[PDB]
Structures are given as C-alpha cells and as structure tokens.
Design a protein around this nucleic acid. Sequence first.
RNA 1: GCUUGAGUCUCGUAGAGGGGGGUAGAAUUCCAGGUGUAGCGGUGAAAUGCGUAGAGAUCUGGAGGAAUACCGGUGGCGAAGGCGGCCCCCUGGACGAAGACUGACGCUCAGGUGCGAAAGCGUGGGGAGCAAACAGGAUUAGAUACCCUGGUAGUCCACGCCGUAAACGAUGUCGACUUGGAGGUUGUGCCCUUGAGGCGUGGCUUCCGGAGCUAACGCGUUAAGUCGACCGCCUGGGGAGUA
Lengths: 117, 100, 55, 51, 88
Amino acid sequence: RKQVSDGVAHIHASFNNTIVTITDRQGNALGWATAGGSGFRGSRKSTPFAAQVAAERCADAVKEYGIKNLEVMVKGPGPGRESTIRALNAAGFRITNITDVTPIPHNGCRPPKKRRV
Amino acid sequence: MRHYEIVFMVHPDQSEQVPGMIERYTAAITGAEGKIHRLEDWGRRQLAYPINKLHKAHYVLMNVEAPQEVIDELETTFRFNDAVIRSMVMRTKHAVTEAS
Amino acid sequence: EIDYKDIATLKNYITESGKIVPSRITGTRAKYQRQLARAIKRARYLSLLPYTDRH
Amino acid sequence: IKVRENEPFDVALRRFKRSCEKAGVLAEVRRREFYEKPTTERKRAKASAVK
Amino acid sequence: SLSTEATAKIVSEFGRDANDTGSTEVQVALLTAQINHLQGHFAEHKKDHHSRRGLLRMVSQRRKLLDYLKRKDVARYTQLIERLGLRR
RNA sequence: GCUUGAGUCUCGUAGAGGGGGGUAGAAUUCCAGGUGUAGCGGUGAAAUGCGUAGAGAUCUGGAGGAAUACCGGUGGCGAAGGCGGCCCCCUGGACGAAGACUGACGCUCAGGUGCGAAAGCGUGGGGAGCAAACAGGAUUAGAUACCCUGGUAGUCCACGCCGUAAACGAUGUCGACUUGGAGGUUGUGCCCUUGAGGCGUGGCUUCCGGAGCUAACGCGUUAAGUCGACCGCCUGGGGAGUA
C-alpha cells in the first residue's frame, strides 16, 4: 500500500515513556508504537527493554509500505532512545541519519517548581 | 554628523529594483550633505536559516556618514518598504573603507 | 573578532550546532571573546550564521 | 544532530548527542526558576574547582 | 557629558583666557550648562534615577563652589550669578 | 600665599550602569488543517486528568505573551536595591596617558531629602508559561502538608503607593602607615618582537598566608593590624520590638 520506501523514525523518549512514530519524509505518520502499549505498564515502561520492544513493534505494522531507508529523529532524554535505534537496525532498516531534535529553549518559558521529595 | 553601517536584505524577486533603490538611498544621504564611504552589493547570497521561508536573498552594505535624522527616515523607509527584509544600522566606529 | 562580516573567522569560533565556543577551549583573551560573541550574534541576526542546526 | 549514512557501515555510533544537549541541558530546564540556588550552586562549583 | 566645542566656548567666555579651565567661575559655568541641558533630558524619562544621581552631584558641586567663591570674593560672586541667571 | 588634599580641561579605554523605542531566534500554550491509531500523562506505586466525539506522536499555517540558551567566567558595571539576545536614540559614572588651570574649594553628618529586591495596594491594560488561594487524586492513624492532576490573584506593561529583607563582606564613611605569594579583569610606557617576548607602572577584584590582633573561630596592605576625624548603635534572658 502506497509504497513509500523511505521514512523517518521519530522516537520520543521521555522519562516515563518512549513513543516511536515511523513516518515518511513529508511528515505523515505511517504507524506508531509506545512502550506503554506493549505490556509492562508502570515502572517498567521506562526502560531500554521496553523501548526496544516498542521499536520492534513499530517496525512491524509498517510492513505495508516497504520502508528500507529511514532517518532517526530523537527527542527528549530517557532510558530509551539508544536501545531504540538499535532495535531499528535489528529490523532490517538501513539507518541513514541519526539527529537529536530535543527542544531547547533560548531561555523561554518558566519551568515548573517541583519535587521536594 | 556621525558614522553608520547599514546592511539590508532585499526580497530576491525584487533584485532588479536593487540598484535603483541604492541610488535613491544614496541620494537621500546627499540631501543632508552627508557622504557615503563604501557601498557593496553582495549578490544573492544563501541564507543560513529561512525567513518567510524565502532562502537566498540580496544583501547591500552601505557605511554612510550622515546626521542622524536622515538615518532615522532611512530606517522608516526600511520599515514600510515591503521589498527590504532585515535592515541593520550600526555604530560610528569611525569611517571604514575596505572589503570583507 | 572585531568584525562580524568575516564569517570564516566567526565560523571557526562556533560549534557544529551554532553555539559559541567558550574561551576555556579556544584561548581568546576575554576582551576578544566578548567582541567575538557580540559579532556572532550580529551575524546570526543577518542570517550569515545560523542560530542552530535545526531551522 | 545529523549524521549521514556511510557507504560501508553497520553502526553510525554518532557522538553528536553527547557533546552538548542530553546530559545537562535538558535535565537543567526541568525545574524551577530561582536566581538564588544557581548563584550558590555556581559559587560552590567554582569554589570546589580548586587544588 | 557636554560637547567639546561647548566646553571650549564656556572656557573662552568665563576664563581669564583659554587654558584657564579650572577657575571657579569656569567650573560653575560648565556645571550650569550641563544642569540646564539635562533639565531637557529629565523633563522626559523621569525615571532615570541613575542619571539623576549624576545630576544631583552636579548641583551639589556647583553649590560648594558658589559657597567658596562667595566667601572669597563677593564681587566675582555677584557678577557670576548675575551672568548665569541662577539664584532665582 | 603655596601645592603634595579636592576639583576643571584635553585624548582614549572597558563595561548586563540608567531611561525610551524597535527587532530577532529557539521553546511552551492555544487555534485551524493533513497523516495516523490505541492509548497518553503521571508516580515509589497509583489514581484524579486527557483520549476512538480520534488523544498522545507527527507535519503545515497562524496568534499571543513572557524570558532572553551557547558566550558566561570566586567575569563586569552600579552608592545600595540591582543590571544578561541584537540594534538605535537620550544619559550617569569610573579608569588610564601626558600637559595645563583653580588654589584647601576638604572629611563626616543629627534633623531633612532622595533612591530602595520580593510580596502587597490603587487605577487602566495584558495574560503564553509558572503558580499562593482553591478543587480533585493519593499518602497517612490523621494529612487543612510534602507527591500527582487542574488552577484564580499574582508574576508582565503604564502611572501612583508601600518601605521592608539573612536589604549580609551579619564588617558605617573618609584618610594615613605596616612583610609576602598565586591568579582574574581593564588601562599604559619602555626595551632585537627577533616565542607561547621581556621589564615596569596604575584602577578594580579572588584565593592563601606573615607580624599583629582576636574569647576562639578567624581577619590578614580590600584588616577584624597600627592611628586620626565624624556619625550610627549596645548595656542580662523573657515580656517585646509588643502595648
């Protein structure tokens, strides 16, 4: 179906969850997979293992497109992200670019207070 | 009558109106008996980042000594004129004449 | 350093992602680190240099 | 940031991420505007950097 | 502060000659010139509390010099404040 | 009278000093639209919350407000509070070089006057983020808290008020003298520069230490050493900085 043959893997690692979205070069999503949607709810959805099985599961569900090349775009910090791109070249993809696209303000908005734990 | 360095980008699609504008601007300087020291037309140069997207734009370096009033109306001329995007006028750093 | 239009020189004194390099790395006596940075910023306004590498 | 595919490579192993953004810069902008704790955190950081 | 041409003009008006630039009438007249010019600046702005501190240093210093010159030669005092239009 | 105190003039230097105006780039939120699909968010774990009315992710376009990454540094400037994108306009001070000029014009200062973070108050705007109050979820024996999800005043602008802070080097101001070392920052002179030169002379500042002082801790040419001038303040704890 529609046979795009090149895409972008936007991986959005945060501290609590990694969410991998495989799209095309136009930016239209072709299929996604989160670490929290792969079993292991909770303290286990923020691990490199959960991110890699999230990326394995996002490599599935884009078989209908015949993607061979993809760029990787990485957001946020997280226990994910590093393992995530590994799972992508464990799934036959030719990984072309690895950009880190974490949003950094140039002293913009005030961050929240928190955490007197 | 103090020194100024004017640069300004021009929309690429109005590049053919560039030297005319230059003349008018220079004419305005000579309206106040101020003199113009260098003047460079840097061609359509590639922008390091997009602006209204609009890549490659046309740069003009000026380096004029003038009284501040004609520089001020030159700034308002750069405000209203839709052709010119990003002017920048600067300091004295007394009169220069060289290339880069 | 004194000048901002020489973007070869300025491009040496900047990292691969558009950020100004500290004088702790490049030597550059503090007076010229200040002129340097201020010239880098005047150049980033003119789009001679980039603010970042994700524009 | 960006690293182009090499002609004969298995792992890109980009270090672009490490030299700048991940470790410090994003973990710093998770929490409060002070003006006060940074003046003392930098004061004791520059007072710890001593022989 | 003040223009070089302006300072030179006031030194030429109030001194014994040029190069007599530290006499008491001359200092008073230069302080006076700057006080009036900054009356024009502080009618606008009005919340430039830093520049005003410089201005009140000028006012106080002018006052000290007028007190000196009053208790040295009173004829120079009356000619001086007569010419500068101060004292109200 | 005189110049060694104080000040004026000439020429430069560095600077987030102040006030007004403009602009730029990242990011957050919101709105509209494309792709796409079952979760997202959150936590120690959870739940409230958002989500098949299509969220989150992702791309495009727009609006708006605030703050200005990197440079950035026991770096700088300011009397103190404090001041951080870039550009213009108005403006204050400091420091240095040689020379000229005035000629004690100086120092401190009760009352007085001015400036004075933040929160707060008044009038009129603005309102993206953050967030007292507040609400819900948890935690707990309880939880009027810490943690989570929302969230109003406020924070932002104009003008006026308030008049305080661990407003702190817990060290009043001004001046003089008294062994050193390593730095930082900003001037400048001289001398093969024949480096990543050498040798000096100022201004501000950081760390360590000698004599001396100190109850000790420590201060130590930026004194808490050795003196002088003037001011402010103290006199056991509480009651009480209260009536």
